[PDB]
Amino acid sequence: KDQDRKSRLMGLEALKSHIMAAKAVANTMRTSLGPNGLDKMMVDKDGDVTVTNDGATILSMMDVDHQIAKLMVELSKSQDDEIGDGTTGVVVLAGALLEEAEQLLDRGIHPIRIADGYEQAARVAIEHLDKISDSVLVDIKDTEPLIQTAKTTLGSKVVNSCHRQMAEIAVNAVLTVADMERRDVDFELIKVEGKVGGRLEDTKLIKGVIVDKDFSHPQMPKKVEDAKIAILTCPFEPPKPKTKHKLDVTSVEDYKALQKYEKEKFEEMIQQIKETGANLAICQWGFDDEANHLLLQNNLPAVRWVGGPEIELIAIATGGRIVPRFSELTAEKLGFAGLVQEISFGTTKDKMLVIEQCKNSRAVTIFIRGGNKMIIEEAKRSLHDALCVIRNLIRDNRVVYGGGAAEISCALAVSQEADKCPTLEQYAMRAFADALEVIPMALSENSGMNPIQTMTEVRARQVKEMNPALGIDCLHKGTNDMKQQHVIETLIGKKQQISLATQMVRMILKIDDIRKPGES
């Protein structure tokens, strides 16, 4: 059915057409590579306007209707969870490998043979990266250089104004949820949130759970020491529903009875706090001024106007249980915490609920403040790089020098080993070397320098001047040798960068027919 107007194209004309689409996605992002990358003006469907150079955000907003380009976006969706930093490096490298592959199709190479050639060269590159790697925190748990390296990458984003305070926060979070000995960090437990107001320096790390809610009365204890956290759906007062009140009195005989239920239940409900021994009373709907009177004399802290899902978030962290009705009240369902406090952000009366365990718990969240919503969001993704950076640093202390030093060193090894490949993949191995050089060649172009002259000069220095790898000085600092500049990327980052790029090239090279039925 619907064979009319069906897509029909195969052979080299189809592969070159597929390669043409991937190059457009790469060339669009090749300029946004590095700290000197050119931003991209994104207009949302709702009419908003945003500007950034994040490779991940560019691909999420880039709604390319071509199918080959969609696979390039699906690839980057997984990279954000593994590498974090070089999302543009994967797409830029894939476009380079496909562009060089087009020269091979004219020579008469099969796409599957090029796929085997890149897989062989990708193993040579991954083997070479471990040789030129270096450790940081080997055989010792240290916090000083772990703050230093993560601080360098953050300096490019909008967190540059207070970049130092963010790096120390990302260390205590991962150090809290995960142990450096086991070296198995869980990025899912490290949440992220924020609110407009204050400045970037006001970002904090909550060892526990945080919900932007205040006490039922300002005279409540600013620090709750007792570990008796009663969580309910209704407040300890004459009960009201969770959805809507809709007060419509009928007559006075009913109204005067409501006054009786006040004195009857305000004392009885708050007496239940003493019968069971609860101290911090968390509840969906808030308290009236009457219950605040009884709560203050006995030093009974309590939260007010907590949301639907906000209730469950505290029970998971504190290990408590929800008491949806007062008949189900008991001592076993009460939460547990070391100390709960109220953080009043200076002149701004935020008064956020801060339930802490007084130790390194298995749940943390970094609340990013800021005077501009556009700077907070770009700062939220800036910190996201530090997490995956610190995650890979702990999972593997081995790291390699960034700035394109690794790509140039890998290209030399692949070029030498290509001579030892007596088969048609020899032309493909050479193409992998030239494609690796596009990442450093792109940083030189984006910095306003001659790409080729800067490319070959660094490569000759990696052989003639000295054997250790040397990078490109994109920030116009003193000189090359990024080891002095302290610009170092994770070994797991580069290994997955060229691996995901090769896997996408093989997946695209092994497709020669995009069939779609047309509307007749």
């Binding site: 020579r107 190479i109 001579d419 030892k420 490949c421 007596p422 088969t423 048609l424 020899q426 032309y427």
Partner: protein, 77 residues
């Protein structure tokens, strides 16, 4: 690759195989059209003088350098 094409061989696999034989061996490895495949040319007694290969690169490169230096052509009268 042009010699391999004329000899019925694959233009790529012929030069791709010979580039490994030259990395490991010497210049004796070359295309033998009499037998239809790669063979040790030193044994086949198929040689040429050195001036042919040297004068070819010398005169060809000078022509390429000359053609590269042409910025434009002017029609006189």
């Amino acid at each position: 690759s042009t010699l391999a094409e004329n000899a019925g061989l694959n233009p790529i696999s012929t030069v791709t195989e010979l580039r490994n034989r030259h990395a490991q061996g010497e210049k004796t490895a070359g295309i033998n059209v009499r037998k239809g495949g790669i063979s040790n040319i030193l044994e086949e007694l198929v040689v040429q003088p050195l001036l042919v290969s040297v004068s070819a690169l010398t005169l060809a490169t000078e022509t390429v350098r000359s053609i590269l230096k042409i910025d434009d052509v002017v029609n006189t009268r």
